[PDB]
Design a protein around this ligand. Structure first.
Ligand code: NA
Ligand code: NA
Lengths: 142, 134, 135, 144
């Protein structure tokens, strides 16, 4: 039973980076992979573990997801998420959402309670709100 | 972009990805993260993959290409990840990485960028964490 | 859904697909037709594919890339790849539909697991074949 | 080897019992006219891309078929169109999804492939992109 997580791949320079900044990334990745291990060891589904890991990576402002999401050319937030269950081969995805704190949670909901694989913006948002997911202002991602 | 793949005790594979897209993204553009088999793929019989990088990543189907290289090409996880990330993507002028777990519990975290914020560990074992190469 | 695949004189393959989705579909939903590898794939090294069918299944199956990968990596014929995807993998996941496919050698296939598929094909300077029903 | 085109106009539950020979020949006539335009173009030495683009454009323009004109309705009595095109030579692809104000999505899809670093555009973004490159805005009523 095993978990891997990532928080983006790109041009990171040791120059223009202090050890203390680097530790906040190391601490963060480290806390999320532990939460995942603990859950796996407890016998939680590989789906539940990947969902909560990505939810945590979203909530963490250091990563480009949920809080700490980058801005568009038009100074907005458009979040995408996907999840796939290797067991049932079902998949769920949302693209271009602004009003959902945790897109990965909306992606799971699409996988589980929808014939559709992929939903977009207001479609995805309204779908999610109709099943009790809370509406948020995109301010929370900044 | 962030990601998680996992193999549970029952032998189930799952993958997940979430992103805000490219900094300064033209609105209403779809990157590879919401696209099944580009940003994301899981199969209990093969592998779970979560990629980050997305024009090339859409057209390349990096996530399902791992499964197909293994399932049909008879490559190992490590052979497949080496091929997609360190040969095919660089060749197509596409920079990023992925995390992958196969059904046997082999783990791989290839990337062709300076760095990739990454972490992994078996259950009950202590985690490994990384930023730069090696 | 409607599609076209083609091999030109210069050895080039291309695929295209267009649809209005499943009748009564929820707005702001995406089928497999606009997704590289689901509705549509073309590679000069392998095959040109345009699929039509139940959307979720063709997305989760990557029907159109899976033909190409079975050929390019598994060494399958176009016809063995088509039999595998359309008659075996899709029905197993609940997907009814079919696809059209041309490989780099100029083999053509029009597999489907449905009662019918509006289809047609033919070589340059030759007459077309047209079909609706099976056989 | 030999230049060739295949086309499809959808797959599903088509009953002999719900059709007269003459109804059927409408589809055969339509199918055979499109495949022939494609054959002629290939025989004339035209790219596989141009040929598949024109074929799907014509399949869209044909109301017998669920693309562009003759497209089915959404739950809200509107029309949402997707299209994708891929060149096996360049491995370049373009797609539009959930567009309603474009006569011919396959033409918008090629436009994304060719004048854009993006592979896939959705709704207004796709349409704004298309309108800004001289492609005409239409009422979705034309598809009905
Ligand atoms: Na975050
Ligand atoms: Na039509």
């Amino acid at each position: 039973a095993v978990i891997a997580i990532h928080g983006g791949a790109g041009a990171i320079s040791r120059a223009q980076m202090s050890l203390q900044q680097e530790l906040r990334y190391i601490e963060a990745l480290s806390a999320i992979v532990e939460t995942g291990q603990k859950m796996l060891e407890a016998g939680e589904s590989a789906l539940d573990v990947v969902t909560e890991a990505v939810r945590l990576l979203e909530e963490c402002p250091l990563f480009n997801a949920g809080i700490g999401a980058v801005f568009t050319r038009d100074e907005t937030h458009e979040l995408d998420a996907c999840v796939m269950d290797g067991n049932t081969l079902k998949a769920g995805a949302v693209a271009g959402v602004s009003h959902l704190r945790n897109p990965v949670l909306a992606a799971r909901l699409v996988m589980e309670q929808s014939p559709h694989v992929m939903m977009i913006g207001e479609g995805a948002e309204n779908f999610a709100f109709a099943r009790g997911m809370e509406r948020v202002s995109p301010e929370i991602f900044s | 972009t962030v990601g998680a793949v996992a193999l549970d005790l029952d032998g189930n594979l799952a993958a997940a990805t979430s992103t805000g897209g490219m900094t300064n993204k033209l609105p209403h553009t779809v990157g590879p993260q919401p696209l099944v088999g580009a940003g994301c793929y899981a199969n209990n019989a093969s592998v779970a993959v979560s990629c980050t990088g997305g024009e090339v990543f859409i057209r390349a189907l990096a996530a399902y290409d791992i499964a197909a290289l293994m399932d049909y090409g008879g490559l190992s996880l490590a052979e497949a990840c080496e091929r997609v990330v360190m040969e095919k993507l660089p060749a197509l002028g596409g920079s990023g990485g992925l995390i992958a777990i196969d059904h046997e519990g082999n783990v791989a975290l290839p990337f062709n960028t300076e760095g990739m914020y990454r972490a992994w560990g078996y259950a009950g074992d202590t985690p490994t964490t990384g930023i730069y190469r090696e």
